[PDB]
From a paper:
The S‐layer of the bacterium, a layer of protein found of the surface of cells, has received a significant amount of attention over the past two decades as a potential target to combat the growing threat presented by C. difficile infections. The S‐layer contains a wide range of proteins, each of which possesses three cell wall‐binding domains, while many also possess a “functional” region. Cwp19 has a TIM barrel fold and appears to possess a high degree of substrate selectivity. The protein also exhibits peptidoglycan hydrolase activity, an order of magnitude slower than that of lysozyme and is the first member of glycoside hydrolase‐like family 10 to be characterised.
Here, we present the high resolution structure of the functional region of one such protein, Cwp19 along with preliminary functional characterisation of the predicted glycoside hydrolase.
Author numbering: 30 to 387
The structure:
């Protein structure tokens, strides 16, 4: 059946939970949200279980997420994840656990204030500062193993249907990994080595998942441009930021090597936008997966509703037009909507999705 997913982001309490330190209210906020999503045809919840090197689940590896209580590491008095999963399943909805692999801190947060048992505190060798934030080093084999193991815990212990990574990889062109490169890089072009570091993580996460539960899917949602045609003649007829260059996310390699089961390019632009034309990009991405077994879903930017903050771009108003176009491409297998709150908070969006999905 067609994929009809919504992202439920927990970072900064974006979509869920609205309330901290109140188990009953958090539970009701979630079921009410699922009910509204189901009512418009959403069949899959993609829920951020690791927003910030943390866990919205009981873990022997990673600390409780601050977004449940206000305090990182604080036990909220229940494990939310069984509830999040079981309530999705009772409504006939699939559940994909979404992880951010490398993030550790937000801007200006002190690394020294993490909980004692935090992996980044126990393993200072793993941590790289970039600007005013800290990250796990994608180039360390121990870091990759730790991420694999962190996901494997969730696969083993919870009835998930999928594992999902979003679009954050290396945080910028530069990154203070010279020592890592010297030790492990074999003199390879450094940027190619960084791309391969990310590829290796994806490969190893997929393999781990399959060795436990073969039918659990693994997917990634990268940024919507891989390379512009101006950098690579087989790239897209677009301008602006490229995932290949800017975060070392080589989505084409992932597809060609079968490192993922599904891919969700974030096409958060209107049809006709010169720099990043939705209509050109759906075609480009459909062609990328042709002849592979990688499922293509389009990331839909319904959060853009004409605000000046987005230069007046209004994706929500044209969502029927976008999905109608998607459906012209047999390689496109559905959509993921950013984000759940936008569906919940808008009667117009609800009406449009009902008309697409009923
Ligand atoms: Cl290898």
């Amino acid at each position: 059946k067609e994929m009809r997913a919504a992202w439920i982001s927990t970072v900064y309490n974006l979509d869920w939970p609205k309330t901290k330190n109140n188990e009953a209210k958090q539970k009701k906020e979630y079921t009410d949200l699922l009910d509204k999503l189901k009512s418009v045809g959403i069949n899959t919840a993609v829920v951020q279980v690791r927003p910030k090197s943390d866990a919205l689940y009981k873990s022997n590896i990673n600390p409780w997420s601050e977004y449940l209580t206000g305090t990182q590491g604080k036990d909220p008095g229940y494990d939310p994840l069984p509830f999040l999963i079981e309530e999705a399943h009772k409504r006939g909805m699939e559940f994909h656990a979404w992880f951010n692999p490398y993030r550790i801190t937000m801007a200006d947060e002190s690394i020294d204030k993490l909980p004692a048992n935090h992996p980044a505190k126990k393993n200072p060798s793993w941590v790289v500062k970039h600007g005013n934030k800290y990250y796990y080093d994608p180039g360390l084999p121990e870091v990759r193993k730790y991420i694999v193991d962190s996901i494997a815990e969730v696969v083993q212990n919870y009835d998930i249907d999928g594992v999902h990574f979003d679009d954050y990889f290396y945080p910028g062109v530069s990154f203070n990994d010279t020592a890592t490169y010297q030790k492990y890089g074999k003199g390879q072009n450094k940027d190619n080595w960084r791309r391969e570091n990310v590829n290796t993580l994806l490969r190893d996460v997929k393999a781990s998942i399959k060795s436990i539960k073969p039918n659990v899917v693994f997917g990634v949602s990268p940024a919507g441009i891989w390379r512009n045609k101006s950098s690579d003649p087989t790239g897209s007829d677009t301008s602006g930021n490229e995932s290949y260059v800017g975060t070392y996310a080589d989505t084409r390699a992932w597809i060609k090597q079968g490192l993922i089961d599904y891919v969700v390019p974030q096409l958060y632009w209107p049809i006709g936008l010169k720099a990043a034309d939705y209509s050109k990009l759906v075609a480009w991405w459909a062609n990328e997966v042709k002849g592979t077994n990688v499922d293509l879903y389009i990331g839909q930017g319904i959060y853009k509703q004409g605000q000046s903050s987005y230069g007046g771009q209004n994706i929500a108003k044209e969502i029927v037009q976008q999905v109608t176009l998607n459906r012209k491409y047999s390689e496109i297998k559905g959509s993921m909507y950013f984000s759940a709150k936008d569906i919940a908070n808008s009667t117009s969006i609800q009406k449009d999705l009902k008309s697409l999905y009923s």
